[PDB]
Amino acid sequence: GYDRHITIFSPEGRLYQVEYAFKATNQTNINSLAVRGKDCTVVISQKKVPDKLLDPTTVSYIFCISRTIGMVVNGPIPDARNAALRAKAEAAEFRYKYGYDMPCDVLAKRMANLSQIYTQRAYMRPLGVILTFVSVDEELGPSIYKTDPAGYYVGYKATATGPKQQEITTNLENHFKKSKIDHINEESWEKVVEFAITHMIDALGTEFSKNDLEVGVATKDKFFTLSAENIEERLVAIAEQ
Amino acid sequence: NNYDGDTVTFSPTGRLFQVEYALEAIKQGSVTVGLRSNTHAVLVALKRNADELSSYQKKIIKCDEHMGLSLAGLAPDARVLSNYLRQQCNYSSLVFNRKLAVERAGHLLCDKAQKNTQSYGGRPYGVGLLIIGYDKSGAHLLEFQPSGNVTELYGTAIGARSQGAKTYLERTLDTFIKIDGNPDELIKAGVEAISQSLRDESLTVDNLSIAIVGKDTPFTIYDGEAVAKYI
Amino acid sequence: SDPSSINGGIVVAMTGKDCVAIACDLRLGSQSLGVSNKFEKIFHYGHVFLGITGLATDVTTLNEMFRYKTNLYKLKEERAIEPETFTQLVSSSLYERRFGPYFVGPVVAGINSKSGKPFIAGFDLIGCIDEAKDFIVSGTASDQLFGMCESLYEPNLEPEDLFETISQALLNAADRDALSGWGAVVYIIKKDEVVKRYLKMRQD
Amino acid sequence: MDIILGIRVQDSVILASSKAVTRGISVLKDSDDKTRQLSPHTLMSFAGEAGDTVQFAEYIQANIQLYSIREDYELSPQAVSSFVRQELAKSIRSRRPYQVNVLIGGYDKKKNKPELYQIDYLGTKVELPYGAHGYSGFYTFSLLDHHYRPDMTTEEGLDLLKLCVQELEKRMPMDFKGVIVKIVDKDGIRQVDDF
Amino acid sequence: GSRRYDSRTTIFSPEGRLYQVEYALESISHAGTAIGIMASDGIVLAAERKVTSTLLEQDTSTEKLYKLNDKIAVAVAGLTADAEILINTARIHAQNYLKTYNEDIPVEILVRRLSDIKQGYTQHGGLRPFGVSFIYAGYDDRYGYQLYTSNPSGNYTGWKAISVGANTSAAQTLLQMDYKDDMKVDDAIELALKTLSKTTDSSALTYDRLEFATIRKGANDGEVYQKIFKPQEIKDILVKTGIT
Amino acid sequence: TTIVGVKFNNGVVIAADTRSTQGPIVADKNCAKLHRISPKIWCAGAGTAADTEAVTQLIGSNIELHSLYTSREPRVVSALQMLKQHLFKYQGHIGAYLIVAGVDPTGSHLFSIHANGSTDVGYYLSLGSGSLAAMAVLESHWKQDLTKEEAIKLASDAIQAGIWNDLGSGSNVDVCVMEIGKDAEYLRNYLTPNVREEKQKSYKFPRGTTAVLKESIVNICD
Amino acid sequence: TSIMAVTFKDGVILGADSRTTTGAYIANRVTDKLTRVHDKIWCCRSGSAADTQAIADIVQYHLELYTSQYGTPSTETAASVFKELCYENKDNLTAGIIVAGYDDKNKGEVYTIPLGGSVHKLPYAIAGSGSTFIYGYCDKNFRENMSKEETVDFIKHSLSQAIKWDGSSGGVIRMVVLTAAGVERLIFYPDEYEQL
Amino acid sequence: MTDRYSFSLTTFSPSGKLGQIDYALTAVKQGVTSLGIKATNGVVIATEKKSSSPLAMSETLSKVSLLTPDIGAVYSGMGPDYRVLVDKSRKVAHTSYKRIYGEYPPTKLLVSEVAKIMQEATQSGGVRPFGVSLLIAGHDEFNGFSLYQVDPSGSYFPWKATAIGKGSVAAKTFLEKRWNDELELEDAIHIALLTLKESVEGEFNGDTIELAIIGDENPDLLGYTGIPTDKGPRFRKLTSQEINDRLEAL
Amino acid sequence: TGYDLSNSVFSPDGRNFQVEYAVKAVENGTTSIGIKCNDGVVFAVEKLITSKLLVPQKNVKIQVVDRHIGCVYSGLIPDGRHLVNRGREEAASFKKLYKTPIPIPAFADRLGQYVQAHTLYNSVRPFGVSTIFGGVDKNGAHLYMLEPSGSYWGYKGAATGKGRQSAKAELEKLVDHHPEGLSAREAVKQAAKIIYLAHEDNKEKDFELEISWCSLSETNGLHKFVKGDLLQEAIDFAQKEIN
Ligand SMILES: [Cl-]
Ligand SMILES: [Mg+2]
Ligand SMILES: [Mg+2]
Ligand SMILES: [Mg+2]
Ligand SMILES: [Mg+2]
């Protein structure tokens, strides 16, 4: 069945290469999670450095796409970096052509359209990645938009991605059922990060040191990643609680 | 097996079968030998004929005044690669007034051969070449294989039963390496080396092809009556 | 060497009460030499009328082009093109040759078949739409036509009156221009009849 | 080049074309036929820039002959003249335009009418009772305006043409070495041998 | 590389047939039947729609009969979308001819170019052919009234009467039976419907499952008029010949 | 042309005269020089009439597609950027001199664009042949903190200075007001201070004055 | 135009007049010729307004993309991007640009890019039509490692003189201060600087 | 490198079927139900917003899209394919019509352009067909209101009313009983809402239902005043609240 | 199945088997390592002496890129050269536009994106090499290892080829026993040792050692080869420790 090697329809109207691209999404065995504060958007991802020979600082799946947009990737790193370089270029071009900063949701749509093309054109393979874009949009406020190999995207109140994503998802659904609102009603991003890590701990049932996590924060007019020490400071606050 | 349809396909053990099959055409090729001292470098090539009415195919091609090669395998492929070399030697002279280093000639051939091993529609070259030359760092011998692998040597041989000559040279090393300032002795050591690869048939006047380059000798080719002196 | 005044010619359009009129001379010359006295400058595509002055080769080319485009329009849209729409098509088409223009001064005239409104418009060689309630002028005697129209014209003229006005505007403008005249043609256009009259004029 | 004339009478089109080919201060030839048969009932005379004239004429001829073979049918004079006009109208905006003016004389077998078309290098087409290109027009148009009638015979048209050539021989500054005259009618194309 | 996934749409079978053309013709044979009949004073085009739903908009619909220019129409059998690609091409080609020669395009010349396009898809470019067969009804002043058919092979031929789509074998025998040369348009109209009536895969032929057109000399003197019948007019002509 | 733009409290206003010329001749007495780029971004144009119209329409089209694509109200800086980069690419040969103004989610904006592609920012701007007459008025009467009604008055005064003193400008004043939180209001022929006086005489001819040679009914039907 | 950029103890200061001119008509008397291509890399623009804007927009885009991929660009890098554009398109550009920025390693740096698209690293730079009149003044009064206030005075006095003699120059004197502390905009009006 | 797939990936099988088009329609079959109904003074198009997670904000995903101010589209099948078709459809309305004639295309012609785009993915080299069926509802001055279905093959048909996707066979039968040629717009909205309840299993409210109309011109939605011939878009997406009002009196 | 016959095809587990097959060609090659030190990086490689006829010191395998970056690789040699040629074009283009020589992380992504691009289409074959590379820039020393999938990370120490597991284990030692850092001259010795210790996994033929290094202090941040006295001194240190 050659309908399983390229992106043409199978007799049941399915694209097997797209489906198998989703399965590569979990190749790295990392889970990621994004939530929104009042003033901010936080994204946390597990950081797993197996080899002792690796320089831990160079191992990351969070990217600074633009001054305002951050992106976390679930999938193998080569495809991840391919996607990050493209999104950086598209965000820079958009700013040049249209005179304002590319909004998170528009970049998401653009990267999704690019992915859709790979599902329809034979010579291009899908990228085996899922892209979670975060920012504090100047019109829409805190924003999370996520892209997959199908070319599908949508905005989220909060989201999770990875092998244990369903655990984290229901954990978060239950919080928002309870809280009655669209976001974490918290003043500082410091406490939203704390929320994010706390509910990842509950859902995954694991403890984290400062080198087991990776954190990206989006505020009005910058997106930045935290250091080991910024995270350690954050883990301590969670402990004294 | 299933993985030998084109150059763009690896086998599960990580082999490139079209490249290996290209290598095989070399092995079906008539033997040729190269070896060098510190002052000269020599090519000897046993030429092959179709039958008794036919000419003996030319195996040695001049690339510049200070460089040239012998071939074993597909001859038109040698014509292409030698022509490319001719152009590169030419470009070096016209642009930089510089004679192309034999080592650079090696790298440029490696890089040309390699492109055909990674792209669809292409095919690897089906010829092996022995490149000799005298440049600004002395005499040189190079072995080109169509996998793109190029190797600098004191001596070697390629083609049918090249293993006889290659052993001989491996023994003779410390002798022929110091045949400095004597052309006809280095040639003799090549004709002797090539004779280790003969069978049922031996070297004649329209059979043998010798080329030599070195310190005060432009790369030149000897055939016919001019090689009788060596049989 | 001024392409718009090699051949000569004029076109004028005018609105009246529930009617429009469009008129042109018949001259085609090569500078001083008059060549043809039969060169009409007004064409129609369905119920939309187009007059074109300027370089005669471009006049012919554009007619052939707008026949082409309005024919395909009709086949795809299953209805005749309206004056407002044709005007836009004329403009797009001229601006498409922005840096190598057709040397023409086209004029559109007609009555919208849905609304019954009378409509006229004119264009520069490069596609600018000049819309007017009253009159449009074009050609080598455009100054003269402007002066004739600006004094002779009054709103809401009846078809037979409008005929006299537009004819007198054209005839007297043409007679003060070396490159215009040699005959005239006047179209009176109402909701669903069109009369074409050939005027008698001086032949020098 | 220089002189090409055409008159359409009752049942034929007559084309007259000067015989001189002049380069510099030398008349190189005095028997040049400035015409191509496009189809059996269509004739094209031409004048303009050296080289361009014949190259254009022959190119048109090839195209029309191709059309004839493909459809086993002769294109009408009106149809040919439009093809020709469009070719020149394209040419005028090319890198190097064809500087050629033409008269096309044809007999339409379906209408049983003769037709004369005058087209200049810009692609300016016009149907006429009589036509000319170049300075010839400045003498003949007024002469024909006077002596021409629409119902003249082929014989009367030839005499009218004789009047035109005589006037051109009198007042034109250059010796154009007479004309070759050709008649296009219901029976095709023939050349008048003594003019 | 990509060679693995190439069907080779433009190759000969060992018998010297064109696989894809044959299979396109097989596709076309399941399409609503279309008939053209040529009379001494006009041409009829009649075609059956693919099995209607009661909720389809019957009046503002066009699946079978298209206008090419004022003197030429076609009836379609096959993929509608493929047909529209070719129809717009033909419409443009007609206009280029008119623009070039200031004369309406002769029917055959338009037919040949469309057939030549189809042919190209069978010989080069590795694309699937157009799954369409046309009946061309047209008039020109050289041959008068003409009928042609063209199919995915890009071969075309002229006819007094012809059918395409479903049950052409049945239909062609029936036309052959009752057709005659001195026949008038109104007889041809009657023959066309009576033929569809007998060949249809439906229970009975109704106005809502038909498209109908005529090319008469039915206006004012030596001039031609195309009539794409409205639904109500098909209803009347179906009654006027007593099929309903 | 004279065209102007003036900022105020809660928005921006642009205005223009309505004269179009071919040399010394007035081709159009009431042409519209205020162009809609999007509902709340309007452009006043001077220069080559076809070019201002074409460039304003093209960018307006691309802005609509952009707005649909981004699910956002379009911004002036986008129209500004697209216009400037287009004009610059054409090295001045597209003779469009534009005053771009509008309101968007960012606020109210006022810019000008030169045919070569350079852009300005200001509280008051004027372009075209009459721009010096206009700018004289703006430099005399402009102040920081204008009401809507003051800016309209200032703008139309500036255009009047052009109408009366520049031979390149005349006829009427069009205005368009873009206020934050409201619909743009396009005030076509806001002022008509050049109405033709009654003619002394009627030149309606006695019927039959014109000599006719032929008549025929033209067939426009099928 | 009169424009300049001056390195000093704590960083660099850019200065410019505010006059845009078409012939003798002042199209803009409040122009901003000090343009940001990055947080702390700015430039002074002189020549064709259209050319220098189009160049700055392109450079800003290039450095934004550079940042995304490799972090903060050096001032030298910014000057190189300008040069590349100015040099390779020398036939179609009329742009005299001064590039000035602040690193933490390199402190204040000034690069000038004249018409041909050559690059020149200098302690300070003057350019634009008005600059001719202050070569004398600036050469005599510039010292290395001036304080912020001295540098502001040096620029204010210099441009005051450029504006005084060059009819093409005029309006306000704008300045941009580039230090470790951040980015400060200064403006000085005619009534202050005219009677220095 | 680059596209070496210059041959068709859709070819005729010996039975004469076009495999990929059939399979594309199968994906459309699996798609969520969507429908459209033509009234005498309007058209309604509606579908179910089947949210993927409850953490997703389904307002951010528009299944019903404005194409021109008087034309809307909805679909059944693959969402990504639809999204890019809408992008191309909006652009082609400008490039091949508005930039030429200075007005928006009539429904049938815009539909014709989309069909063409879809037909080419059925024959061009190295692509698969679009896995969607579109319903396009619109108005234009000379044809009035119209509703069109566009399939993966590129074929399109005008409808009085119809449905596509999951429960289309059932829903089409529902629509045959209820549709008459005298329906007012509010009557068709009501029928649309009834037809859609059949095929929706979960929650059924204005937050899970997406519905738009092509009806009267909306001057309040224009964004400006002063040109009396510009009257505003006839396309209007009903709000969450507007739908719930109609679901009470159901 | 048949999922492994064409590059860029995902298998049902979400793998690209052709890339995995490329890795087998890498694992089949000679051993090569890289050690990151205090202010620099060291590279060494095993050159199998096929025959006496190979001229010693004259089939060089370590390659310089620009003036400050070293590259070594194990697998298909010509594939590695092709990759370095590209890296040279990439570094030249970066320097041309931005003046400053290309930073190492920047350079790493250039190769990464290029190698990754050869896993996107069926019309190209993935790279049959793993490449160890790095040097010194304005932010210090960097060592990288890049694989046929396009995957790369920064390394304290790295190894590839047939002796990779031997070398890896030996590298982990130095990381544990020098947590405050390793000097460049020390790393040159250790490099030599590890290649000798890794040669056991390939001991049919005997071999020629080749070392290079970039050190801010020892080589001014430039890439130089280790030859002569310093090479022999490290060859000897290694000969010590295999006894
Ligand atoms: Cl896109
Ligand atoms: Mg694909
Ligand atoms: Mg006159
Ligand atoms: Mg310039
Ligand atoms: Mg001054």
Side-chain angles (χ1 to χ4, degrees), chain C residues 27 171 173-182 201-204:
Chain C
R27 191 177 176 272
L171 258 16
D175 288 349
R176 280 285 169 183
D177 185 20
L179 306 188
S180 298
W182 252 27
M201 71 176 296
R202 55 183 315 118
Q203 298 289 303
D204 61 347

Side-chain angles (χ1 to χ4, degrees), chain C residues 71-178:
Chain C
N71 279 353
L72 294 178
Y73 183 93
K74 207 186 162 165
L75 285 161
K76 301 161 69 148
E77 304 250 8
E78 280 163 333
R79 71 176 169 96
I81 194 155
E82 297 297 337
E84 291 88 348
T85 303
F86 183 70
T87 290
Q88 290 299 147
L89 178 66
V90 169
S91 187
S92 310
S93 297
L94 296 172
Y95 200 85
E96 188 171 48
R97 288 284 154 274
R98 172 61 180 88
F99 294 118
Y102 295 107
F103 297 107
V104 291
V107 175
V108 164
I111 288 134
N112 189 281
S113 79
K114 217 80 187 316
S115 78
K117 279 186 207 287
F119 183 93
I120 59 172
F123 319 74
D124 63 15
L125 80 170
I126 220 73
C128 180
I129 303 150
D130 171 17
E131 197 178 313
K133 320 124 174 288
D134 43 16
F135 54 91
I136 292 298
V137 306
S138 180
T140 46
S142 62
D143 289 10
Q144 293 93 321
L145 282 166
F146 266 129
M148 288 311 299
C149 291
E150 197 65 69
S151 36
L152 293 193
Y153 183 83
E154 56 190 79
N156 298 125
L157 291 164
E158 295 289 329
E160 299 84 358
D161 291 325
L162 184 63
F163 168 77
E164 298 299 332
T165 298
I166 196 177
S167 291
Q168 287 296 319
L170 182 138
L171 258 16
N172 295 281
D175 288 349
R176 280 285 169 183
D177 185 20

Side-chain angles (χ1 to χ4, degrees), chain F residues 121-200:
Chain F
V121 197
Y123 290 97
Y124 56 96
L125 304 165
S126 69
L127 258 32
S129 52
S131 76
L132 277 78
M135 183 57 79
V137 168
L138 299 175
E139 289 281 43
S140 294
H141 298 323
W142 182 88
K143 45 155 159 99
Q144 190 65 93
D145 274 303
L146 291 162
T147 66
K148 167 187 181 178
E149 277 84 10
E150 290 174 317
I152 291 171
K153 221 270 159 160
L154 182 50
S156 67
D157 277 5
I159 296 295
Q160 274 190 79
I163 284 156
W164 306 124
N165 309 123
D166 180 35
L167 300 186
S169 320
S171 286
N172 308 133
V173 182
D174 295 354
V175 177
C176 184
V177 189
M178 286 136 286
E179 192 172 0
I180 297 166
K182 307 193 154 216
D183 292 343
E185 53 175 332
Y186 175 58
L187 297 171
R188 170 65 160 173
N189 288 11
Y190 175 62
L191 278 173
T192 52
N194 280 296
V195 179
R196 229 256 222 202
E197 75 173 41
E198 254 197 283
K199 286 205 287 277
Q200 291 290 118

Side-chain angles (χ1 to χ4, degrees), chain A residues 12-235:
Chain A
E12 40 279 342
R14 284 168 56 180
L15 301 166
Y16 281 109
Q17 284 293 306
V18 170
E19 296 183 1
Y20 302 167
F22 272 92
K23 266 180 258 165
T25 256
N26 293 323
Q27 228 246 290
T28 54
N29 192 219
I30 291 309
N31 296 282
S32 80
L33 176 169
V35 290
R36 303 185 303 174
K38 261 150 64 79
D39 281 356
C40 64
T41 305
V42 172
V43 70
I44 67 167
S45 160
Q46 292 177 255
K47 175 175 183 169
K48 289 185 190 168
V49 197
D51 197 336
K52 224 190 281 140
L53 293 181
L54 289 167
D55 173 3
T57 60
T58 68
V59 180
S60 178
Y61 290 83
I62 295 185
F63 301 83
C64 300
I65 298 305
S66 77
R67 167 155 292 107
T68 64
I69 299 172
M71 178 188 78
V72 60
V73 184
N74 281 82
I77 195 62
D79 283 17
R81 285 164 175 164
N82 174 117
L85 176 60
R86 185 50 178 270
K88 284 167 181 167
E90 293 284 339
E93 185 189 305
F94 184 97
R95 174 60 187 78
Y96 174 70
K97 284 192 149 161
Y98 306 108
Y100 69 102
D101 295 329
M102 190 169 206
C104 179
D105 62 298
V106 181
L107 171 60
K109 171 175 182 178
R110 173 62 184 159
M111 295 302 299
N113 286 156
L114 252 20
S115 294
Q116 186 286 143
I117 286 160
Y118 316 147
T119 76
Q120 180 154 209
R121 210 105 69 190
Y123 87 109
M124 290 260 42
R125 85 170 166 76
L127 294 178
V129 295
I130 285 168
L131 314 168
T132 311
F133 297 97
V134 294
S135 75
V136 185
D137 186 61
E138 70 181 317
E139 305 195 29
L140 288 183
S143 286
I144 306 159
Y145 287 79
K146 173 163 78 180
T147 283
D148 56 37
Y152 167 93
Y153 91 107
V154 73
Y156 289 94
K157 300 174 161 119
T159 196
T161 302
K164 295 261 253 303
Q165 150 254 120
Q166 183 52 68
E167 268 97 335
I168 301 155
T169 305
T170 35
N171 181 302
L172 290 163
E173 297 181 16
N174 293 141
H175 180 270
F176 290 117
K177 228 225 201 75
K178 186 170 216 187
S179 77
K180 214 84 256 140
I181 53 170
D182 258 20
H183 54 99
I184 310 324
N185 187 236
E186 205 69 52
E187 308 298 354
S188 59
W189 60 262
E190 281 95 339
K191 288 224 110 66
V192 173
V193 171
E194 283 165 23
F195 175 99
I197 302 170
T198 280
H199 286 246
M200 165 146 287
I201 282 166
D202 300 351
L204 286 197
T206 34
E207 217 73 273
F208 298 114
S209 73
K210 68 192 191 193
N211 313 285
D212 301 327
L213 290 181
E214 191 166 50
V215 184
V217 188
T219 41
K220 217 212 165 196
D221 295 311
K222 48 184 301 210
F223 165 88
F224 58 99
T225 68
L226 307 183
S227 61
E229 270 29 69
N230 299 140
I231 294 161
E232 176 59 46
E233 201 192 319
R234 218 84 266 112
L235 260 19

Side-chain angles (χ1 to χ4, degrees), chain G residues 70-138:
Chain G
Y70 326 117
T72 307
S74 68
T75 307
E76 188 174 31
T77 294
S80 186
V81 177
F82 271 107
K83 177 217 81 216
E84 204 80 348
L85 294 168
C86 290
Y87 178 68
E88 295 293 337
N89 297 289
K90 54 165 63 176
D91 294 345
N92 310 305
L93 296 175
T94 310
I97 300 171
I98 304 176
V99 180
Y102 177 78
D103 282 292
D104 225 301
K105 165 157 273 157
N106 294 286
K107 313 288 155 189
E109 284 186 347
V110 169
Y111 298 81
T112 189
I113 302 164
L115 260 49
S118 58
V119 223
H120 309 271
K121 192 181 185 302
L122 302 166
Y124 78 105
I126 55 158
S129 54
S131 68
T132 56
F133 305 120
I134 63 183
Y135 274 79
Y137 183 87
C138 293

